[PDB]
From a paper:
The bacterial chaperonin GroEL cooperates with its cofactor GroES in assisting the folding of roughly 10% of newly synthesized proteins, including proteins with α/β topology that fail to fold spontaneously. GroEL is a cylindrical complex of around 800 kDa containing two heptameric rings of 57 kDa subunits stacked back to back. ATP-dependent binding of the lid-shaped GroES (a heptamer of 10 kDa subunits), capping the SP-containing ring (the cis-ring), results in the burial of hydrophobic surfaces on GroEL and displaces the bound protein into an enclosed chamber.
EL–ES1 complexes were further classified based on the positioning of the apical domains of the GroEL trans-ring, resulting in two conformations referred to as ‘narrow’ and ‘wide’. In the narrow state the opening of the trans-ring has a diameter of around 45 Å, similar to the EL–ADP7–ES1 crystal structure (PDB 1AON31). Indeed, the apical domains in the narrow state expose the functionally critical hydrophobic residues in helices αI and αH, forming a continuous furrow for SP binding, whereas in the wide state the coherent binding surface was disrupted. GroEL without bound GroES is below detectability and may exist only transiently. By contrast, asymmetric EL–ES1 with and without bound SP on the trans-ring is abundant, defining the main SP acceptor state (Fig. 5(ii)). In WT cells, EL–ES2 complexes are also functional. Conversion of the EL–ES1 trans-ring from a wide conformation to the narrow, SP-binding state (Fig. 5(ii–iii)) appears to be limiting for EL–ES2 formation (Fig. 5(iii–iv)), because the ratio of EL–ES1 wide to EL–ES1 narrow correlates closely with the overall EL–ES1 to EL–ES2 ratio.
Author numbering:
A (entry chain K), B (entry chain L), C (entry chain M): 2 to 526
C-alpha cells in the first residue's frame, strides 16, 4: 500500500512522543512505592497497577509514527530486562532519558554519529565503573542473600536456590514444580536441558510461567525433518489414547505438519508439543540418541531407515515431566533406565578420553554434564493451591535474579550505584565537543532511575540523588523506608547484570535513535 | 475504464517526485556508514535499516504518476544492480542526479533528443574512461583480494572461491551447500548448469536465496509439451510417497497443469517444481538426453511415443541436489553413473571432432563443459547454524562480486573512480549547445556516489572529492575510516562492471525519462 | 433507463474533445523517432512506448461523450490501418485534423452536407493524385526492396517472401512457421485458405497473433446446423484422448453448443475451435467436401442422414496444421493423400471445362486454385528462439507491407506524397464556398503526417515540407537521418493503400459527424 514516508527529525519527534508516552505511563510505578495506573477493560472493574511492565503492555498509540517510537523503546526495554532479569521500569527510565537527550541534541542540527560515539564511550565507561562497584555474588551465602532480596527478603527461597546450587551445581539444571502437601521437596533426577524451545507459539499451555509443561509426555525421537502429516497420523492417533501428551524433538517440523499439530492442540483432540532437536548435523543425532537413552526411547532416522508411519510409543521416549521454555527444552526424570544413562555417560566419557580436539572435549563435557548431572527438581509445599503457586513464582523470580548475581555480581540497588558512576565519570570527555555532550547524556540520565523511584515514593528525587552523591561506594537511599544509608546493609541490591544490560540497551536504542534519517509507515486509512 | 491521460513535463514532474522520494529515502544509507531508516511494521518492533535497497522496497506513493516515476526509476536501479552486481544505492543516486538534471533541462522548453544524445555520448565516453582506469582482476591473487574486500575483509571465502575455480574452472559451476560440522568442504561432482529457471514463481520454497532447492529430487525427463493433468497425475501420485520432491524438466507445461501443480504445492500434498528444457528445436532433446544421462533417467518424448501416464520413477532422473535459479536449473551430483557420463562425454567429443560448423562446435563445447566440467561444491562448516548460514551468504556475495571483477576488472572504489572519469572528461563536448548540457548532466553524477557515501558517513563530501581530484589514479578518500589515500592501497574496490552498469542504466532511465510526451493511468477512484 | 439526449454542435464539441485527446496522445510517437509515452501501470515499472497505436488503446475518458469521440476516432484510425496495412497514427492525425476543422466549421454554422461534399470531393481528388503519383511495386526487384524497407533494411526477409511468391504464386497461400535450427526453409504442402474465421472469440489460443492455431487437429466436417450438445458429447469425448484439439468446420453452431464448447475450452478439458463452413447453400457442401478430401475426412450432412452422435475420429479430417484467423481458416498440410488431392483437382478441373456460367466458372477457378496451389510454408531459422520469433514477426510485417505495395504501388515516404498531392490539388474548387472550404480542410491535413513525423524526430516540420515542395516527384526529407533528397534513394516507402485509406477514412468520419444533429447517451449514475 501507499507509504507515509518521513525523514529524520519528523520521524524523531513522533518517535520521541511515543517514547515519552510509554515512559511517562510506565515510570510512575518505578521503585518500591510506585503509583497507580487504572488500565481499562472492556467490561466491569478495571485493573489498578503499580508496575511499569503492566502499564507498558497497555500503551498503544493510534498514530503509526508515535506507535513506532513507543514500540522501539518498549522492545529495547524488554531486551534490557531479558539480558538483565529485572529493571524493566528502570531500563524504561534510562531509555527515555538517554533517547530524549540524544534526539534533542540531534534536532539542534548537529552530527548524529558523534553523539552516538559520545554516548557509546560514556556507557562503556559506565559499565566499567559499575563493574568496579560490582561486588561478586558467587558463594552460596551471597546467592541465598540475593535470592532473598529478589524474593523480597524471602529466606526459604534463597535456601532452595543454594541447595539446588549444591546439588546440581550452580550451572546445573533446576526446575521448581508443584508439591503434594506443605513440604518443599528438592531432589536430583536423571534429566537434561538442551537449548531448544517450542517450534510454534501455540503449544504453550501455562501463561503464568510461559513454558510448555507436560505430565508424563512421550517424546518423538525422530532424527529427520518432518514433512508429511501422513507420517504422523498413526503416531498422533496412538498418542490420542489414554489422555497423554506428546513431545516432538526432531531436526525440523515443516509448515503443514506444524499446522495440523497446532489444530489438534486447540481442538482438544491431541496435546502435542514440538521443538527442534538439540544440535545440528552430526551432533544433533548424537544428542537425540542421548535423549533417547535418558528417556528410554529409540531414535527414528532415515539413516537407519526408520519410518514415522511405523513408529509406536516404544520408540518414543518417556519422561515424568518435560519443560519447554522459549529456547529451552528440559526433560525431567526421563524413564530411561539409570544404568543405561550411566553407560551412555561412560561411553561419551571415553569419547572425552579419545577427544583429541578442544571443541570435541568441550562438547563432550557439556554432554556428560547434561546427561549425568541431571535436573534439580523443586517441589512447592503449601496448605492451599494459591500460596503454593505464588511461592513457586517467587522461587522462579529469585532464581532468575540470583543467576545474574552469580554471573556478574551485585551493586547497591535503587540507582545509587548509578549515582556512584555519575560521580566517578564526571571526568569523561569525548573525541568531539559533540561527543562530550553524548557522554553526559548517558551519565545524568543514569541517576534518573533513583530519581523516578523516589518521585514515585512521594519523596524528593533530587535531594536523594545529591545525598547519595555525598556518600560513596554503596551508600544510598532506602526509598520504601524513605531513609538513606548503605544498601548493602539495608538490602536493596540490583544485580550488576541487570543494571549493565539496562544501561547498555538504553545506549543501543539511543544510538539507533540518533542516526535515524528516514521513516516509512503505512497510511492510516 | 476511465483513464488519466497527461502529456510531457506534466508527466515529467510527477515522475521526478517519485524519483526524488525514492532517492532521498534510499541514499541516506549509501556507503559503509549509512544512516538509520526505520521501516514501519504493522505490529510490534519496526525495522531499523542502513541499506538503500530495504528502504526502496518500502517506498510506495499513493498518486499514480509519482508511483509511476518511482517504480520505473526503482526498476532501472535494479537493472543497474543486476547488470552490475552491486551499487544499488549508488545506481539510485546516479539515476536521480542524471534524471533530475535532464528533466529540469527539458522543462526549460528545450529538445529531449539532443539531451538524449549528449547524455548518451557522455556516458559512452565515461565508460571508456572507466575502462581505461579499470585494472584487470583475473589472476588468482587479485581475485582473492577482491573477494576478500567484497566479503568485508574475509580471506577464507576468497580462498574457497579460488579453489572452486581451480577445480572446475572460473567459468565452471560453483555451488555452496551446508556442511556437517565446522569444516569447509570443497569437492567436484557430476552436474550441469543450464540456463533454464523455474516456470512459475510459486515453486520457490526458500525466500532467503530466491531459488528452488530440492533434496534428492526426481526430474521429469519429458520431451513433449505438457497439456493435460491426466498425463501428470500418476507421476504426482508416485512422487507423493516417501516425501521426496519432483522436478519437471520438459518442453513446456500449459496453464492448467501448472496451476494444478501449484495447488498441490501450497496444499502440501506434493512438492513439485517445473522448469523448461534447455535449448530449443533439435538441441533441446539432445540436452534433455544429456540431463537424463547425468541424472540416470530416460527421456519421455512423443517422437519415441512415451506418455506420462506410463511414467514411473525409473523414467525420472535423479540427482543428489538440483538448484533452480531465476533462469538457471543447476543439477548437482546427478546419479547418472560416471562411466555413463564418460561415454556420453566421449560421444559428444566425437561430435566435436565431427563438428563442421562453428555454431555446432560451440554448442558441443558448452555441452561438454556442462556435462563433464561438473559443479564445484563448497560446504560451509560452522560451530552453529546461524553463522553457518551467514558464512554461506557471504560466500555467495563474494562470488558475485568476484565474478564481475574477473569479467571487467576493478576500479578505485568509494566513488573516486567516477571522480577520475569526470575529471578526465572535462574535455568532452557535444554536437550542440544542448548536447554539451547532456554531457554535463551525465558527468556531474560521477562524484555523487562518493559524496552521498561520505555524507552518510557523517563527514564532509566536498573537499573529499576535491582531494580525490587533486590525487591521481586510485587516490581518494576512505569514507569509513574518514581518511584519504588510495583504494588499491586501503582496499575500497568496486568492480568496473558495477559502476559501468550503474552509469549506463542511469543514462538509459534519463533518456526514457526526458523524452516522454504523454501519460495513461487509471483514475484514483 | 433515463437517457441523456444531446443535439448537434453540443454533441460535436464532445466528439472533438475525444478526437483531440485521442490524437494528441497518439501522434507524439509518429515517425521513426517517436517520443516516449510512459503508460502508467497498476503495478511495478510502467510501460514506456513510442507507438501511436499503444497510446491509442488506453485512451478512455470518464465522460460518456468524450470517450465517445475517442471511440469512433480510434475506430476510424483502426479502419484506415486495416484497409491500409499501416498508418494508424497517420490515420489518427488525418482524422483528428479533418474532424476538427469540419466540426468547427459546422459549429460556425456552415452547411453540413456542403462541408461533407467539399471534403469528399477533395479526398477523392486526393486519391486521384496519389494514384497518379504512385509508382507500382510489382516486379520482384521492387517487391524485395519494399520488403527490405518495411522490415527495416532486411533483405533476407524480402528474399524469402519473394521465393514464396515464386513458388506458390503471389495469390497463393503463404504461411510462416517456426524453424528447427538456423535455416530458413521454404516448402509447399497441401492446403486451402477459405475466408472463414473462428466462430467465437474465446477459441483463440494465441493472443500475440489473434488467430486460432492448432497442431495436428481433428476437424468436424458437419454439413448441418449444430443446436444440441447431445450430438456433440461423443465427438468431444473421442477428441479428448491423446491430448489433441478439435476444429469445428460446420454449417452453423447455435448458442448452446458454442457455449458448452467455450466452457470446455477455458476449463481446459478439450481445446475446441469452431469455424463456419465456407460458402453457402450448394457451394458450402462442395467446399466442405473439398476440405474433407484435403484432410482425409467425411462430410456429415443431414441430407445423407448421418449424425454427430456416431462421429468418431475417422470421420474427422486431419491436417498437420490448421490456421484459423479472424475471418480466415488456412489448413496446412492436410493429411488427405496427394493422389486424392489431385483427383479432386482433376474433377473440379473437368467441372471447369463443363462450366457454362461465368460466376460458376469463377467459383470453380477459386476452388482449383485453393485446392492445388496449396499453402506455402516458410520456416524462420535462428540461433535462439526469441530472435527466431522476432524474425518471424518481421517476416509477417514485410509480407503485409509488400502485399500492400503490390496492390497499390508505392509512393515516396515520410509524408511527402500527400505534400505533392496538396501542391497538385491547390486548384480544386468545389460546388460551393462551403465545398471549397470542404476542399481546403482535406487539402491542408495532407502534410500533417510528415509534419508530425519530423516533429517527433525533433526536427523542423515546416522547412521539411517547404523543401519537399521545392523539390519535385519523390524529393523529400529523411526524418530519422535529418537529410533531404529523393525518398526512393534513401529507401523510405509507404504503400499508396496506406495513405489513401488513412485520408479516406478521415474524410468519412469527419463528414459523418459533420452531418450529425442529435445524440443520446446514458446518465452517468
Ligand atoms: N527500598 C528501596 N529503596 C531504594 N530503591 C529501591 C527500593 N526498593 C526497590 N528499589 C529500586 O527500585 C527498582 C525497582 O523498580 P520497579 O518498579 O520494580 O521496576 P522493575 O519492575 O522494572 O524493576 C530496583 O532497581 C531497585 O533497585
Ligand atoms: N571505507 C570506505 N571508504 C570509501 N568508500 C567506501 C568505503 N566503504 C565502502 N565504500 C563505498 O561505498 C559503496 C557501498 O555503498 P552501499 O551502501 O553498499 O550501496 P549499495 O548497497 O547500493 O552498493 C561502495 O561502492 C564502496 O565503494
Ligand atoms: N527516415 C525517415 N525519414 C522520413 N520519414 C520516415 C522515416 N522513417 C519512417 N518515416 C515515416 O514515418 C512513418 C511511420 O509512422 P508510424 O509510427 O509507423 O505510424 P503508424 O504506426 O500509424 O504507421 C512512415 O509512414 C514513414 O513514411
Ligand atoms: K513497583
Ligand atoms: K550501507
Ligand atoms: K514510432
Ligand atoms: Mg523489578
Ligand atoms: Mg554495496
Ligand atoms: Mg507504420
Amino acid at each position: 500500500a501507499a507509504k507515509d514516508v518521513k525523514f529524520g527529525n519528523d520521524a524523531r519527534v513522533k518517535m520521541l512522543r511515543g517514547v515519552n508516552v510509554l515512559a511517562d505511563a510506565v515510570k510512575v510505578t518505578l521503585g518500591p512505592k510506585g503509583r497507580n495506573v487504572v488500565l481499562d477493560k472492556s467490561f466491569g472493574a478495571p485493573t489498578i497497577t503499580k508496575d511499569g511492565v503492566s502499564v507498558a503492555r497497555e500503551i498503544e498509540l493510534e498514530d503509526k509514527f508515535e506507535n513506532m517510537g513507543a514500540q522501539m523503546v518498549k522492545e529495547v526495554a524488554s531486551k534490557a530486562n531479558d539480558a538483565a532479569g529485572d529493571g524493566t521500569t528502570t531500563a524504561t527510565v534510562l531509555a527515555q532519558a538517554i533517547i530524549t537527550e540524544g534526539l534533542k541534541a540531534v534536532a539542534a542540527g548537529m552530527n548524529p554519529m558523534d553523539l552516538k560515539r559520545g554516548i557509546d564511550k560514556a556507557v562503556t565507561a559506565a559499565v566499567e565503573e559499575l563493574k568496579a562497584l560490582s561486588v561478586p555474588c558467587s558463594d552460596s551465602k551471597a546467592i541465598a542473600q540475593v535470592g532473598t532480596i529478589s524474593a523480597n527478603s524471602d529466606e526459604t527461597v534463597g535456601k532452595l536456590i543454594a541447595e539446588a546450587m549444591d546439588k546440581v551445581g550452580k550451572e546445573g539444571v533446576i526446575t521448581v514444580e508443584d508439591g503434594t502437601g506443605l513440604q518443599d521437596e528438592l531432589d536430583v533426577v536423571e534429566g537434561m536441558q538442551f537449548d531448544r524451545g517450542y517450534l510454534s507459539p501455540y503449544f504453550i499451555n501455562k501463561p503464568e510461567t510461559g513454558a510448555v509443561e507436560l505430565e508424563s509426555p512421550f517424546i518423538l525421537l525422530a532424527d529427520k525433518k518432518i514433512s508429511n502429516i501422513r507420517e504422523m497420523l498413526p503416531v498422533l492417533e496412538a498418542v490420542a489414547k489414554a489422555g497423554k501428551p506428546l513431545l516432538i524433538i526432531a531436526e525440523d517440523v515443516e509448515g503443514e505438519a506444524l499446522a495440523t499439530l497446532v489444530v489438534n492442540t486447540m481442538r482438544g483432540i491431541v496435546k502435542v508439543a514440538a521443538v527442534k532437536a538439540p544440535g545440528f548435523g552430526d551432533r544433533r543425532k548424537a544428542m537425540l540418541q542421548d535423549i533417547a537413552t535418558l528417556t528410554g526411547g529409540t531414535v527414528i532416522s532415515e539413516e537407519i531407515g526408520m519410518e514415522l508411519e511405523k513408529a509406536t510409543l516404544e520408540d518414543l521416549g518417556q519422561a515424568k515431566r518435560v519443560v519447554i521454555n522459549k529456547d529451552t527444552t528440559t526433560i525431567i526424570d526421563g524413564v530411561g533406565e539409570e544404568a543405561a544413562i550411566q553407560g551412555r555417560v561412560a561411553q561419551i566419557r571415553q569419547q572425552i578420553e579419545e577427544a583429541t580436539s578442544d571443541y570435541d572435549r568441550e562438547k563432550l563435557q557439556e554432554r556428560v554434564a547434561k546427561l549425568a548431572g541431571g535436573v534439580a527438581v523443586i517441589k512447592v509445599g503449601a496448605a492451599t493451591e494459591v500460596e503454593m503457586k505464588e511461592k513457586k513464582a517467587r522461587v522462579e523470580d529469585a532464581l532468575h535474579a540470583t543467576r545474574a548475581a552469580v554471573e556478574e555480581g551485585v551493586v547497591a540497588g535503587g540507582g545509587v550505584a548509578l549515582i556512584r558512576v555519575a560521580s566517578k565519570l564526571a571526568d569523561l570527555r569525548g573525541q568531539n565537543e559533540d561527543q562530550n555532550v553524548g557522554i553526559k547524556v548517558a551519565l545524568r540520565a543514569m541517576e534518573a532511575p533513583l530519581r523516578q523511584i523516589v518521585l514515585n515514593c512521594g519523596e524528593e528525587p533530587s535531594v536523594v540523588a545529591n545525598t547519595v552523591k555525598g556518600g560513596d561506594g554503596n551508600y544510598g537511599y532506602n526509598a520504601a523506608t524513605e531513609e538513606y544509608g548503605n544498601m548493602i546493609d539495608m538490602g536493596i541490591l540490583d544485580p550488576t547484570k541487570v543494571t549493565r544490560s539496562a544501561l547498555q540497551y538504553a545506549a543501543s536504542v539511543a544510538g539507533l535513535m540518533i542516526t535515524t534519517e528516514c521513516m516509512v509507515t503505512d497510511l492510516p486509512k
